Design a protein around this ligand. Structure first.
Ligand SMILES: O=C1Nc2nc3ccccc3n2CCCCCOc2ccccc2-c2cc1ccn2
Length: 300
């Protein structure tokens, strides 16, 4: 082809009778998500699923199918994928169930049991998920802790491709300055958002710029104010957030560099995050010289 490569992803159409809704998991601007079970008729398999419907219009149906397009076209361990769609009167996106919910709610709920190893590994995994999106020439445009989901406490994935695009109400407090002032979105504007996301996690789910209305945020950033250093953050970790929030986009880190930096820190978590009572902390499992060293799997 002359331009971008052909997108040969498979959109799978699934029958209504192949799956069942069990209960509602949540509602909001993202839509309405149900817990369910998908049982492909031929095979002896049962697959836990999240089923998204909007809370119908021809406009609503366009937007939701644009989202399904993008979700069907991704394939990465730290990115939520579309299993299929069901074409009843209400269009339904069938997705992989993320049992522990969104990471923002998780950090708030399990604050007293989250240690530095988990926090840093989450940062790595999100950076990997985002770096994969960058490799696919795809800008998320809505990265936040509310859009990172928890498969297990050890494994998180990025989701919510409703604003996602190739290279209403908007998430002003997670957006780069240039996006606010000029609607410019790049991979490096996603980095700003990663910065904010990390701050959310390191503060155990604090609202950024809490009390400040969104219309004042642009002039605050112009003046040079940024989100403050969380109590548990070493200067090492805060410095990385601060780089994500530079005026010059190219001066911010690349996602591949963040994978490297956080993975180095993840080898010795207590050097980089100071948490009272750390590593006496337990979270549920499925079974329930050396400073600059980086494993090749993290060096892309
Ligand atoms: O498993 C998914 N959700 C889900 N599991 C839960 C378990 C416990 C309690 C609540 C739970 N929730 C609700 C979270 C909804 C907000 C974020 O989710 C999305 C927002 C936009 C588009 C897609 C998705 C999405 C959601 C799930 C899986 C793949 N994608």
């Amino acid at each position: 082809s002359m331009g971008e490569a052909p997108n040969q992803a498979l959109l799978r159409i699934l029958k209504e009778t192949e799956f069942k809704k069990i209960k509602v998991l949540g509602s909001g601007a993202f839509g309405t998500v149900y817990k369910g079970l998908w049982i492909p008729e031929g095979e002896k398999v049962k697959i836990p699923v999240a089923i998204k419907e909007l809370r119908t219009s021809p406009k609503a149906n366009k937007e939701i199918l644009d989202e399904a397009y993008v979700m069907a076209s991704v394939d990465n361990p730290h990115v939520c994928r579309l299993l299929g769609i069901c074409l009843t009167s209400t269009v339904q996106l069938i997705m992989q169930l993320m049992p522990f919910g969104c990471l923002l709610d998780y950090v708030r709920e399990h604050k007293d049991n989250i240690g530095s190893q988990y926090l840093l590994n989450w940062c790595v995994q999100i950076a990997k998920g985002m770096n994969y999106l960058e490799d696919r020439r795809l800008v998320h445009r809505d990265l936040a802790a509310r859009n990172v989901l928890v498969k297990t406490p050890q494994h998180v994935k990025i989701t919510d491709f409703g604003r996602a695009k190739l290279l209403g109400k908007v998430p002003i407090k997670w957006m780069a300055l240039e996006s606010i002032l000029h609607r410019i979105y790049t991979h490096q504007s996603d980095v700003w958002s990663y910065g904010v996301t990390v701050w959310e996690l390191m503060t155990f789910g604090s609202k950024p710029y809490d009390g400040i209305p969104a219309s004042e945020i642009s002039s605050i950033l112009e003046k040079g104010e940024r989100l403050p250093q969380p109590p548990i953050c070493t200067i090492d970790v805060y410095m990385i957030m601060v780089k994500c929030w530079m005026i010059d986009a190219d001066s911010r880190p690349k996602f591949r560099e963040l994978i490297i930096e956080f993975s180095k820190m993840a080898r010795d978590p207590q050097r980089y995050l100071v948490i009272q009572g750390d590593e006496r902390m337990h979270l549920p499992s499925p079974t329930d010289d050396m400073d600059d060293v980086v494993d090749a799997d993290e060096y892309l």
